[PDB]
Amino acid sequence: MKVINDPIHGHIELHPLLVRIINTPQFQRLRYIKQLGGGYYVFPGASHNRFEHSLGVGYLAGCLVHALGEKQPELQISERDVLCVQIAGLCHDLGHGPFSHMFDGRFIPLARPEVKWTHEQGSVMMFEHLINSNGIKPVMEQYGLIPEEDICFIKEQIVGPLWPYKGRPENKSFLYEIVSNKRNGIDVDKWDYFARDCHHLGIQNNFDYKRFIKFARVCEVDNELRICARDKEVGNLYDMFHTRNSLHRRAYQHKVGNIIDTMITDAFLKADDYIEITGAGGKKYRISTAIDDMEAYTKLTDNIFLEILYSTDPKLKDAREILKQIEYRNLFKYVGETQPTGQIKIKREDYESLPKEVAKLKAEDFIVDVINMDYGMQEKNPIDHVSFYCKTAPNRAIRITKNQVSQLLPEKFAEQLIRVYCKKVDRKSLYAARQYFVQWCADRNFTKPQDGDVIAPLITPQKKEW
Amino acid sequence: TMKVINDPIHGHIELHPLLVRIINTPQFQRLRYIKQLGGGYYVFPGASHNRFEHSLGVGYLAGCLVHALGEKQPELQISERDVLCVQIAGLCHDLGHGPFSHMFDGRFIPLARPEVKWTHEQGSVMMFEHLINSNGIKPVMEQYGLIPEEDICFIKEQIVGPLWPYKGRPENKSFLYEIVSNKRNGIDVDKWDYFARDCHHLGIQNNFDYKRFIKFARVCEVDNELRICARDKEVGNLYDMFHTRNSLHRRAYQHKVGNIIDTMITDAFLKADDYIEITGAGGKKYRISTAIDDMEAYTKLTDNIFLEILYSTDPKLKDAREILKQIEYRNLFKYVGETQPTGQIKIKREDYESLPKEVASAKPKKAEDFIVDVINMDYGMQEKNPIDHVSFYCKTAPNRAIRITKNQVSQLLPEKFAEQLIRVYCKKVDRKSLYAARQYFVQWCADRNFTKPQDGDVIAPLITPQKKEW
Amino acid sequence: MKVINDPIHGHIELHPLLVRIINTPQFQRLRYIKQLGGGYYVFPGASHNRFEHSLGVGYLAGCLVHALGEKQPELQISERDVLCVQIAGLCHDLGHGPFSHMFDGRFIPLARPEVKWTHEQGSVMMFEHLINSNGIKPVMEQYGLIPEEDICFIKEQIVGPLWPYKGRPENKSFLYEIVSNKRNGIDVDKWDYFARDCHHLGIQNNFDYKRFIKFARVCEVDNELRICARDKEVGNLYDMFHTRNSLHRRAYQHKVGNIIDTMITDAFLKADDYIEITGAGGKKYRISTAIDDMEAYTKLTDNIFLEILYSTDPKLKDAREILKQIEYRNLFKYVGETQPTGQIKIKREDYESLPKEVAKLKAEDFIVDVINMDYGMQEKNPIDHVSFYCKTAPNRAIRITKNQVSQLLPEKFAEQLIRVYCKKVDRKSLYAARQYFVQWCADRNFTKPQDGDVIAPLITPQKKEW
Amino acid sequence: TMKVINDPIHGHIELHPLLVRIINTPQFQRLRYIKQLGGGYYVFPGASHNRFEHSLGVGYLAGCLVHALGEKQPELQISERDVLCVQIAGLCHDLGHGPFSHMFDGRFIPLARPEVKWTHEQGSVMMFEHLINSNGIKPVMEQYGLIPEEDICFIKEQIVGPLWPYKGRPENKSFLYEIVSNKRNGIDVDKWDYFARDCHHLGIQNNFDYKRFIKFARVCEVDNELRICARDKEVGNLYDMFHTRNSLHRRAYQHKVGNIIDTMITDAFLKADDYIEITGAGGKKYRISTAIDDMEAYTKLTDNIFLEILYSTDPKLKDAREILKQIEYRNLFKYVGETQPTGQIKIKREDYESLPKEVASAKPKKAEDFIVDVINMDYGMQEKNPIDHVSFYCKTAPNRAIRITKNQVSQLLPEKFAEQLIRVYCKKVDRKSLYAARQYFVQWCADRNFTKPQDGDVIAPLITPQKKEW
Ligand SMILES: O=c1[nH]c(=O)c2ncn([C@@H]3O[C@H](COP(=O)(O)OP(=O)(O)OP(=O)(O)O)[C@@H](O)[C@H]3O)c2[nH]1
Ligand SMILES: Nc1ncnc2c1ncn2[C@H]1C[C@H](O)[C@@H](COP(=O)(O)OP(=O)(O)OP(=O)(O)O)O1
Ligand SMILES: Nc1ncnc2c1ncn2[C@H]1C[C@H](O)[C@@H](COP(=O)(O)OP(=O)(O)OP(=O)(O)O)O1
Ligand SMILES: Nc1ncnc2c1ncn2[C@H]1C[C@H](O)[C@@H](COP(=O)(O)OP(=O)(O)OP(=O)(O)O)O1
Ligand SMILES: Nc1ncnc2c1ncn2[C@H]1C[C@H](O)[C@@H](COP(=O)(O)OP(=O)(O)OP(=O)(O)O)O1
Ligand SMILES: [Fe+3]
Ligand SMILES: [Fe+3]
Ligand SMILES: [Fe+3]
Ligand SMILES: [Fe+3]
Ligand SMILES: [Mg+2]
Ligand SMILES: [Mg+2]
Ligand SMILES: [Mg+2]
Ligand SMILES: [Mg+2]
Ligand SMILES: [Mg+2]
Ligand SMILES: [Mg+2]
Ligand SMILES: [Mg+2]
Ligand SMILES: [Mg+2]
Ligand SMILES: [Mn+2]
Ligand SMILES: [Mn+2]
Ligand SMILES: [Mn+2]
Ligand SMILES: [Mn+2]
Secondary structure: OEEEEEOOOEEEEEOHHHHHHHOOHHHHHHHHOEOOHHHHHOOOOOOOEHHHHHHHHHHHHHHHHHHHHHHOHHHOOOHHHHHHHHHHHHHOOOOOEOOEHHHHHHHHHHHOOOOOOOHHHHHHHHHHHHHHHOOHHHHHHHOOOOHHHHHHHHHHHHHOOOOOOOOOOHHHHHHHHOOOOOOOOOOHHHHHHHHHHHHHHOOOOOOOHHHHHHHOEEEEOOOOEEEEEEOOOHHHHHHHHHHHHHHHHHHHOOHHHHHHHHHHHHHHHHHHOOOOEEOHHHOEEOOOOHHHOHHHHOOOOOHHHHHHHOOOOHHHHHHHHHHHHHHOOOOOEEEEEEOOOOOOOOOHHHHHHHHHHHOOOOOOOEEEEEEEEEOOEOOEOHHHHOEEEOOOOOOOEEOOOHHHOOOOOEOOOEEEEEEEEEOOOOHHHHHHHHHHHHHHHHHOOOOOOOOHHHHOOOOOOOOOOO | OOEEEEEOOOEEEEEOHHHHHHHOOHHHHHHHHOEOOHHHHHOOOOOOOEHHHHHHHHHHHHHHHHHHHHHHOHHHOOOHHHHHHHHHHHHHOOOOOEOOEHHHHHHHHHHHOOOOOOOHHHHHHHHHHHHHHHOOHHHHHHHOOOOHHHHHHHHHHHHHOOOOOOOOOOHHHHHHHHOOOOOOOOOOHHHHHHHHHHHHHHOOOOOOOHHHHHHHOEEEEOOOOEEEEEEOOOHHHHHHHHHHHHHHHHHHHOOHHHHHHHHHHHHHHHHHHOOOOEEOHHHOEEOOOOHHHOHHHHOOOOOHHHHHHHOOOOHHHHHHHHHHHHHHOOOOOEEEEEEOOOOOOOOOHHHHHHHHHHHHHOOOOOHHHEEEEEEEEEOOEOOEOOHHHOEEEOOOOOOOEEOOOHHHOOOOOEOOOEEEEEEEEEOOOOHHHHHHHHHHHHHHHHHOOOOOOOOHHHHOOOOOOOOOOO | OEEEEEOOOEEEEEOHHHHHHHOOHHHHHHHHOEOOHHHHHOOOOOOOEHHHHHHHHHHHHHHHHHHHHHHOHHHOOOHHHHHHHHHHHHHOOOOOEOOEHHHHHHHHHHHOOOOOOOHHHHHHHHHHHHHHHOOHHHHHHHOOOOHHHHHHHHHHHHHOOOOOOOOOOHHHHHHHHOOOOOOOOOOHHHHHHHHHHHHHHOOOOOOOHHHHHHHOEEEEOOOOEEEEEEOOOHHHHHHHHHHHHHHHHHHHOOHHHHHHHHHHHHHHHHHHOOOOEEOHHHOEEOOOOHHHOHHHHOOOOOHHHHHHHOOOOHHHHHHHHHHHHHHOOOOOEEEEEEOOOOOOOOOHHHHHHHHHHHOOOOOOOEEEEEEEEEOOEOOEOHHHHOEEEOOOOOOOEEOOOHHHOOOOOEOOOEEEEEEEEEOOOOHHHHHHHHHHHHHHHHHOOOOOOOOHHHHOOOOOOOOOOO | OOEEEEEOOOEEEEEOHHHHHHHOOHHHHHHHHOEOOHHHHHOOOOOOOEHHHHHHHHHHHHHHHHHHHHHHOHHHOOOHHHHHHHHHHHHHOOOOOEOOEHHHHHHHHHHHOOOOOOOHHHHHHHHHHHHHHHOOHHHHHHHOOOOHHHHHHHHHHHHHOOOOOOOOOOHHHHHHHHOOOOOOOOOOHHHHHHHHHHHHHHOOOOOOOHHHHHHHOEEEEOOOOEEEEEEOOOHHHHHHHHHHHHHHHHHHHOOHHHHHHHHHHHHHHHHHHOOOOEEOHHHOEEOOOOHHHOHHHHOOOOOHHHHHHHOOOOHHHHHHHHHHHHHHOOOOOEEEEEEOOOOOOOOOHHHHHHHHHHHHHOOOOOHHHEEEEEEEEEOOEOOEOOHHHOEEEOOOOOOOEEOOOHHHOOOOOEOOOEEEEEEEEEOOOOHHHHHHHHHHHHHHHHHOOOOOOOOHHHHOOOOOOOOOOO
């Protein structure tokens, strides 16, 4: 065993196989990618990287699976099974690009609309590259793993499929619930990031993962074995999803963290055609195509920000000038927030068209960022997809609907938030943006912006509805 | 000279020598012997803390905020006279909590003396006059530029409210009445202290940042009266604070077992009340329930009385002592389940007494035996949203205050701001008994069209098919 | 199992037998005795009681013994053995009197010189009373304990003996090292109180118990099986004993905490002849004799402070008047601190005589408190009684002397601290005390008091040596 | 207007708009890309923090203390001019740390350019002039009542020392030179920030309370110069701080493996140094080691350069890239053991280079292969006790300062205040090799009459009987 001191979880023992996986270029890459990306430029505590998140997630994947094992030997959880879950935990974020979510969430979508690609599809490919380029496949056999079976089981824990599961049977289904839970989103990923992000952000966590594990249990639920919580834990589960939403409001969708993410993303776009990254057999790739070669994607990290800022080639004057505007803190100015009304959703189809709606300023000048906020399952209540159990009858699982819990829980479980920033920064400009934007809200029958009477005194009498 | 003290929540805090004089008196040191969460200690073993240390934090934070407004806004004319008076209100605001704090004013006195209406604050004010008077403080206030006729009023009114309705300070210094206990919307430093401190000791983490709130607080004209205001951006965090609070009540302050221990103690006190003399003003003897009428005698009434009873041997207390032993041994009245009203049924305080009778009545296939505890849960203002009573302000226009309705914030905020929780416990404890209670109770829920109890299918297999509606 | 949320250790599972032991008058008594006693009147965070200390100690006793078990199955640690250690942990402080250490350390010694008695001799008798008065002896058999053997083993874990051990063999000796370690004082008692006292005091702990357990191991050391630490942990062990000493300086021997302890102790003495406590078969006992009947000692708790203060019988005017002087904060005034020199120890024989030496003020007026400060083993280095082990040879234990560690470790491992307080409080009085006291130091060739030139300007030129 | 920022160590901290102007420059934002503990991150995975956030805390604490003295003692004449200058020194005091902070000024530059003497502070001062000059700050200082001729000196001198030896402020404002970097005894707010922050991120708890120290600090005449002083009672806590520090160096800052990673990087840089151009003032190209001579070019030199190398493909860097890959794969040079000199043998900085040769020489029954790292460990002032250079004061006489020698404190304090630690690593890694290293090294210790290595009987069974003295 090998012990390592993570400040969130303490000293954690790593099995020598997990150490072999860790000490590879593919994994040590996560030392150079920030967890909250743009957040560092707002919360100066948030220097943490995906490397240390990736270790906690592995650690907690083990905690929970040993715990179920101990509490319930009848499950036949093997040391083979425990290792596989730990490995999924470790490798589950292997595929995050530069600035984590900025890459898969803003950059790739703008830079290559033609693909569907997510840090997880990346986490799985990077995992194959890791295994293959570092002779791990042998070492797994060495500790009683069976690669044909287990690499599948690991790949499927991360992403989902590829009864839909080649890796383990319906009798070991609860193992697919640990690292990334499609049934309801209650995963140890969240547990680690809540604790860790709060630690570094300087916000306190309200959610006790240790307690949840104490009360977990595996029960039959429709000829599949799911994980279950004590009946009394249900309150705490609604709170976790609140905590999460609360983290996004305060930190992960901070109005300025987001505009920094956006400014970097634009600089990358300005640089993308002109930056070659060396891959498999010397083939040159661009920042946006590098996700198609894991040799080259290994090299793509937060470094590239500085590669750009510290550059001197004039075909990058474009992108370098943006990034200097961050160093000097000329950000694009925020104009305001608003929300749709009644039953108006906003198609991902239409995001690109929204500045045009907002326009004398040109719409090239506006940015409009549309943020979906849910409890993980779009419109659905994820607690409606959790199985609970009583002290009296510890194997008889049950359902608990919202109305057996409280009336102070939310009526809707998902909303949209629209935020307008302006790229022209002066007071003449920014006033204009503020009048356009407030009339836009009134035109679309969106909400009066919080600041709306103050920034737009002559426009909020336009709407009786305000 | 100043005096430093190390509170583990707020750190080293400087006490003005007047505040030290107030502290070092029998009336205040009394708070060392009263637990903040009372019955909570017998469920959350971390919760040894007493009102003494809460009372210091609240004073400390009362000062923090009032110095802060002062600094940020000199135009407010906040004097060292004013700052002291707020600090003193903070310190003395819980002076009147009885044994086990809330159990006393919330369960005991109501059952033991229906004839009075009385609350730890009415007590905090009387105990404050006693303190001032019995310890020659009145001189010492003049000594630091306080004016007792004016300022003892101002202090008394910060604690309770009145007695423009305020003799103590004008409409131009109204924001000072918002610090220690906020009637406008409940956003007070009392909460801030207890959140931090109760979490510390309970072993829950706090999600609410008081330090941040103070940084963005500011005083603005709102209807020709000067109120405190928050930045527009803080509004999210305020909805969260009231959630945090409600969350604390669910987890800890209304814990099903903490509550039944509170109730068992309260019954033991009732059993002992007729038979325990407490010596007051001029040797007059008072009972536990009448001691609230004499602050000399109420000074002596503390958590001690639990042990005075348990360790006694007088047989007129076999009654109460036997209850309290049943806590030591952990024969509690057994919890049966929880349920909630439906549609828009509230439950009149009129009808609480009648509820066990109802439970005995149910006919699935005595009421002296049942207890039924009705717990009202809100965001402080019964049915109202307290954020709808907060004034915010923009970065652009820092004096122009504004309102922010729920709809400008989120759709994931609560639809209702107050609910009821009904809990049935049974005083007969065995397996034959407790099964019965579980059948009665579940048919009762079905009869009243209340919610299926979460555990309802498991404890009452043959009765939750009675309701199609479940 | 039964879970309970201690804020120091988290949610901890209690075996149903341990719950039965806990839910008794003898144990719930610890809810009404403060851990740091007089400390509460200086550190207002320090409301904590021995009840919750007593649970942590049990919890940690289990942690460590499960851990050795897991790491080393060859030890034959049984569930019988684990329970017994947990029970010792739980019951090890059962015998603390009112204000914990004030009782066994100041009161009983002054009030009954004729006995030798310590909270542990009490912890063992109170344990027999608990077992006997609550039908536990049956319930132990029920979970495979063997009372004749195991109550001995428990009693011996707490106190020591009664190869000197009837409870377990030389092959299970490492179990006697967990709750109270005579070999070197490295016990989980310390671990719990460091963490807990710091939590409540508002001082931070510097010592990581979790890490120590990760590196513990059992090795042969002279045909007895001792617990051993990794070689690298040795630094951290010297630090723990420092942390401890550091806690005593700041908090446990605070000049004012101590004088409050002393004032209470005097009030008790004033009240002792006149307070009857009801024991076995109605026999009446005094506060000082109550340690001779566990029925009556069950009733003796911090309550007695208030029983006195709130009393009205005039044969207690004496003691009640003292306790009011604490409420009002008329403490006896502190005069100063000093230390012996060369090789002058101060016999416990001579403590009573010291005020006489200090004396116009009478010596009835002075108090002189002599505090011994060590690393647990009087003059000895306790690390010189710890066995370590290398990564290379995990069973070959070894010794590590101070000079293989550092030159910044202490030259001596024990010292004395003498503190003079005066019971007459005014400025005329207290000046006098300050001149007496400083001449006293010069007469005994003790150290110049830190404040000595300032409080005694005309006396510190008396000594050339200063 | 003020600007608030949430540092997780100190909370929400208000930044004066001048400080914000200084912060939002290439020279300062550079500190976002330099890790505080450098190689430490590859052992303590929590230690992602950078000098940027340390640099903010140090500024924050520089202000705390100087406002505090001001409040407590108006007679000192501390102006808003003075407070700003100290805050700015705090902010800019680490501006000159190179890549991996201490690895750069402590290992790299010394090996790479013997010809210069240079330290992150000489760099912090030059980078400060560059910042001021390249970003029109000089105007903005006049704007808030600073006087650049005087104040840029005062700032430069707070950071480094001189250039009564101080042009920036008189002997009557000498206590201001004690805040950010204390030559008198090392008791600075730099330490306070790094203790709290490094512990936070390392996963160690701090034992040292800076908040308390500030509460009891006070300025007194000491030899017709005004120094800072501590209460008499604080002295215990000061010995503990210097212990805490030494304790941090043992556990973390000199961790046997963190150090060898620092060394491996340093060798990779050396391998790359001749072959990497960094563009400075007027297009002039500079090497990693010469970049410290041009602040335009040194602005660009950050931790980036590690990855610039690792991700490169130019074959003149096969050298350095191959080393850095050996870190990614965790082929470190293997650690062999630790030992210490004996009696009163120091080890001249003269002789460090010669030590591998000695280890190859030992004849138990090549030196290009060994590395030998000599680590000096003190309480900041080589052989001196820094408490012997602190002025204390009594409650009775708050202006009369005094000395407190070790003997008035304890006998459990350290006999010596500085020691040496010698560590041998071997660059050849296999079992045949590493055994050999372990025999050479243990005979070496016995030859020099150094201490038996703790692991010495186990790694060298046939050699620790060579010494009777063990
Ligand atoms: O007045 C108090 N009432 C309390 O309820 C109290 N609880 C804790 N403390 C702390 O105890 C220290 C020493 O006590 P204290 O200062 O009264 O004794 P002392 O020997 O220092 O005498 P002096 O400083 O008054 O001359 C003080 O600095 C306080 O922080 C209290 N002080
Ligand atoms: N005293 C300490 N307290 C807390 N954490 C520590 C301490 N010393 C080291 N660590 C951290 C750094 C690492 O993340 C982890 C393991 O460090 P360490 O015990 O130094 O292992 P190592 O691999 O260097 O030892 P070994 O010689 O056993 O291989 O713990
Ligand atoms: N070393 C310490 N670290 C943290 N808190 C401490 C320490 N020592 C004492 N305290 C706490 C306990 C009290 O609540 C508060 C005051 O203690 P202390 O400074 O010793 O006051 P005191 O009244 O004894 O000093 P004085 O000599 O001023 O009378 O700080
Ligand atoms: N939500 C919570 N978060 C943290 N601690 C909690 C929470 N709820 C309760 N606790 C504490 C109080 C107790 O010390 C311990 C156990 O409480 P709880 O789960 O309420 O057990 P219980 O015995 O009342 O449940 P059961 O019905 O299973 O018997 O945990
Ligand atoms: N809800 C929160 N809780 C704690 N810290 C927060 C929260 N929101 C933001 N922060 C942190 C991040 C920053 O470091 C600092 C400032 O954030 P914020 O108040 O949102 O500044 P801002 O510059 O966006 O406001 P403004 O509208 O004044 O420009 O506080
Ligand atoms: Fe993740
Ligand atoms: Fe209160
Ligand atoms: Fe103990
Ligand atoms: Fe620094
Ligand atoms: Mg190792
Ligand atoms: Mg997920
Ligand atoms: Mg004092
Ligand atoms: Mg209130
Ligand atoms: Mg229970
Ligand atoms: Mg011990
Ligand atoms: Mg801003
Ligand atoms: Mg320094
Ligand atoms: Mn992921
Ligand atoms: Mn109140
Ligand atoms: Mn003990
Ligand atoms: Mn520096």
